[PDB]
């Protein structure tokens, strides 16, 4: 039972920059260390084994170093396909404990969200439900706030928000907001506004519809 | 080719037990261990244990000693992972990983994963609604997938034809039911002139739904 303290927890670098992740072992693990890359919704991929030996078909911009307890991974010419969570694992003792992980963000230029708002579908209405959906797509950085205004007044509850992980193609994020009402609360109001706040724009982005097109 | 073939998703009641499997093919080294690893969503990889196929000897992390039981069939080159006295804490994705040797080089292969959900809540098919806008060059269309349990569903557009421009979001649980959305962005010359369709599968309830995005 050896412990694996990995560092940093999160990182953010532009393509072409050089980054250095570190795993510390609580005892000596005599180079018996592997680094893995895990892409969202995919299995982990080996990068380096035995501390410094590159795995099959791994580009030379990757290299690991260190010895004893102190180990680190280096990436020199950071490329698009490198995003993800990097783990370390040891095989010295009988318990092959992983480090906690180092999640790697791709840094990109600021982008305002494309906001889109959608009234409840007729099918859902006709069953008695009414969800208003608002997408806030392809924005950067990750930090964002959305609020709902119904006939001018801020609405708190019913709202369910969800966020994607960084996009593999354009390195943006995207967010989804769902305000669920009953059909007959929905029909008691006309103006529904999805209002987004982001650092790209000092004045908030506003998308609305009237219940009567 | 060398590859690890796992079993399909599992749904089970609290207190029950389950037995996942992991098959291998074409490994050069017969002595390498099958290992099992637990991952909760947005959490770290967590080593469970391993087995030595030469003799059936196993090691476990103390946290899984008694919880996990790893078995093998070297006869068939398949290895199983039984979990017992299940709770919600055991809900996670479970990988089988195994190393291999050719010459003086190492190789690390991983299975696809095998999801395990532990809950007393009833299987429920999803209600899928289209999202067309009311009154730009590209137009964004949407799909709302609401009221299902358990995770996962799979969302595609035009039977997977529309692969770029897609954003499918993580499900959110509330009151024993998931709600999920997916957006697609396509050229204005494409819709409504052509048919754009939302495909949803929910294997747990054997549901397959196509929802056309009809305008207005
Ligand atoms: N037949 C043989 O080769 C035997 N002497 C060895 C049996 C091998 C059974 N053990 C395993 O599979 C566990 C694999 C541990 C990861 C390995 S240790 C060396 C290499 N460096 C790493 O960072 N990871 C790999």
Give the one of B47, B106, B135 whose C-beta lies nearest to A97's C-beta: B47
With an 8 Å Cβ cutoff, are B97 and A209 in contact? Answer: no
Experimental method: X-ray
* Domain shared by A204 and A118, yes or no: yes
Q: Which tokens sit at B203?
A: 């294997």
Which residues numbered 98-117 in B keep a CB inside 8 Å of some CB on A? 105-108, 110-113
Q: Please provide the CATH number assigned to the domain covering B121-216.
A: 2.60.40.10
* Domain shared by A138 and A83, yes or no: no
* Domain shared by A125 and A138, yes or no: yes
Q: Which atom of ligand 1 is nearest to the CA of B32?
A: 12
How many C-beta atoms lie closer than 10 Å to residue A176's C-beta? 27
Q: Range(s) for CATH 2.60.40.10 in chain B?
A: 1-120, 121-216
* Domain shared by A146 and A73, yes or no: no
Residue pointed to by tokens 């908030």:
A204
Q: What residues of A are in contact with residue B50 (Cβ under 8 Å)?
A: 96
> Measured between CA atoms, how close is A80 to chain B, in angstroms?
17
**CB proximity list for A81: less than 8 A, separation 6 or greater:** none
> Measured between CA atoms, how close is B107 to chain A, in angstroms?
7
CA distances to A57, A85, A136 from B169, in Å = 32, 19, 11
SS3 A122: helix
Residues A31 and A70: beta-carbon distance below 8 Å: no
Residue pointed to by tokens 């990750």:
A142
* Domain shared by A25 and A90, yes or no: yes
Q: Which tokens sit at B117?
A: 């959900």
User: Is B214 touching A (CB cutoff 8 A)?
Assistant: no
What letter would DSSP give residue A56?
T
3 state SS for chain B: CCEEEECCCEEECCCCCEEEEEEEECCCCCCCCEEEEEECCCCCCEEEEEEECCCCEEEECHHHECCEEEEEECCCCEEEEEECCCCHHHCEEEEEEEEEEECCEEEEEECCCEEEEECCCCCECCEEEEECCCCCCEEEEEEEEEEEECCCCEEEEHHHCCCCCEEECCCEECCCCEEEEEEEEEECCCCCCCCCEEEEEEHHHCEEEEEECCCC
Signed CA dihedral, B82, B86, B89, B93: sign only: positive
Give the one of A118, A131, A162 whose C-beta lies nearest to B170's C-beta: A162
What is the distance in A from the centroid of ligand 1 to the CA of A59? 23
Residues A105 and A143: beta-carbon distance below 8 Å: no
Q: How many residues does chain A have?
A: 213
User: Is B57 touching A (CB cutoff 8 A)?
Assistant: no
* Domain shared by A97 and A115, yes or no: no
Q: What residues of A are in contact with residue B168 (Cβ under 8 Å)?
A: 164
Give me the residues paired with residue B142 across strands.
B131, B183
SS3 A29: coil
Q: How many folded domains does chain A comprise?
A: 2
User: Is B137 touching A (CB cutoff 8 A)?
Assistant: no
**Does residue B152 have a cis peptide bond before it, meaning omega lies within 30 degrees of 0?**
yes
Give me the residues paired with residue A154 across strands.
A149
* Domain shared by A85 and A144, yes or no: no
Torsion of Cα atoms, A123 then A124 then A127 then A130, to 10°: -150
Give the one of A89, A100, A124 whose C-beta lies nearest to B129's C-beta: A124
* Domain shared by A2 and A104, yes or no: yes
- Quick one: which of A158, A138, A144 has its CA closest to A196? A144
Q: Tell me the C-alpha distance between A75 and A51, whole Å.
A: 14
Range of the domain at A147: 109-213
Residues A60 and B7: beta-carbon distance below 8 Å: no
Q: Give the phi and the psi of residue A66 in degrees, each rounded to 5.
A: 105, 180
Given A76, A108, A140, the domain boundary residue is: A108
Q: Which tokens sit at B58?
A: 């196993």
- Quick one: which of A86, A177, A182, A191 has its CA closest to A133? A177
Q: Tell me the C-alpha distance between A35 and A50, whole Å.
A: 9
CATH 3.40.50.300 fits B1-120, yes or no: no
Q: Which tokens sit at A56?
A: 């099959």
Q: Which tokens sit at A142?
A: 């990750």
Best residue in B130, B134, B170, B215 for a mutation probing chain A (most A CBs within 10 Å): B134
- Quick one: which of A171, A178, A175 has its CA closest to A192? A178
Give the one of A44, A124, A137 whose C-beta lies nearest to B183's C-beta: A137
How many C-beta atoms lie closer than 10 Å to residue A191's C-beta? 13
Query: What DSSP element (H or E) covers A123?
Result: helix A122-127
- Quick one: which of A50, A123, A56 has its CA closest to A88? A50
Q: How many residues does chain B have?
A: 216
* Domain shared by A172 and A204, yes or no: yes
Given A108, A139, A155, the domain boundary residue is: A108
* Domain shared by A81 and A144, yes or no: no
Task: Return the half-sphere exposure (C-beta side, CA atoms, 13 A cut-off) of residue B98.
Answer: 31
Q: Tell me the C-alpha distance between B118 and A39, whole Å.
A: 25
* Domain shared by A79 and A142, yes or no: no
Which CATH number goes with the domain that contains A101? 2.60.40.10
Given A59, A93, A108, the domain boundary residue is: A108
* Domain shared by A93 and A119, yes or no: no
With an 8 Å Cβ cutoff, are A46 and B108 in contact? Answer: yes
Q: Tell me the C-alpha distance between A128 and A125, whole Å.
A: 5
What letter would DSSP give residue A39?
-
What is the distance in A from the centroid of ligand 1 to the CA of A91? 8
């Amino acid at each position: 039972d050896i412990q694996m303290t990995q560092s940093p927890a999160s990182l953010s670098a532009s393509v072409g920059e050089t980054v250095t992740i570190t795993c510390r072992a609580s005892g000596n693990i005599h180079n018996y260390l592997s680094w893995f890359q895990q892409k969202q919704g995919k299995s982990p991929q080996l990068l380096v084994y035995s501390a410094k030996t590159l795995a099959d078909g791994v580009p030379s911009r990757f290299s690991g170093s260190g010895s004893g307890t102190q180990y680190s991974l280096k990436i020199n010419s950071l490329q698009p396909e490198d995003f993800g969570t990097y783990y370390c694992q040891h095989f010295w003792s009988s318990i092959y404990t992983f480090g906690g992980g180092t999640k790697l963000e791709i840094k990109r230029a600021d982008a305002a969200p494309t906001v889109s708002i959608f009234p409840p579908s007729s099918e859902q209405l006709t069953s008695g439900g009414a969800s208003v959906v608002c997408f806030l797509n392809n924005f950067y950085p990750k930090d964002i706030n959305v609020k709902w205004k119904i006939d001018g007044s801020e609405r708190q509850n019913g709202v369910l928000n969800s966020w994607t992980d960084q996009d593999s193609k354009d390195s943006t994020y995207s967010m989804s907001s769902t305000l669920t009402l009953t059909k007959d609360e929905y029909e008691r109001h006309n103006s529904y506004t999805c209002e987004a706040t982001h650092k790209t724009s000092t004045s908030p982005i506003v998308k609305s519809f009237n219940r009567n097109e | 080719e060398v590859q690890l073939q796992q079993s399909g998703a599992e749904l089970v009641k609290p207190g029950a037990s389950v037995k996942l499997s992991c098959t291998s093919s074409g490994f050069n080294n017969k002595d390498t261990f099958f290992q099992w690893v637990k991952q909760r969503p947005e959490e770290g990889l967590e080593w469970i244990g391993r087995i030595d196929p030469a003799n059936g000897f196993t090691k476990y992390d103390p946290k899984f000693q008694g919880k996990a039981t790893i078995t093998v069939d070297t006869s068939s080159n398949t290895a199983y992972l039984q979990l017992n006295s299940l709770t919600s804490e055991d809900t996670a994705l479970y990988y089988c990983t195994r190393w291999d040797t050719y010459g003086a080089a190492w190789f690390a292969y991983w299975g696809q994963g095998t999801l395990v959900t532990v809950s007393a809540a009833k299987t429920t098919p999803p209600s899928v609604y289209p999202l067309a806008p009311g009154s730009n060059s590209m137009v964004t269309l949407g799909c709302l997938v609401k009221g299902y349990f358990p995770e996962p569903v799979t969302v595609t557009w035009n039977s997977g034809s529309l692969s770029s421009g897609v954003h499918t979001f993580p499900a959110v649980l509330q009151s024993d039911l998931y709600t999920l959305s997916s957006s697609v962005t396509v050229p204005s010359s494409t819709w409504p002139s052509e048919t754009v369709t939302c495909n949803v599968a929910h294997p747990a309830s054997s549901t397959k739904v196509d929802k056309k995005i009809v305008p207005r």
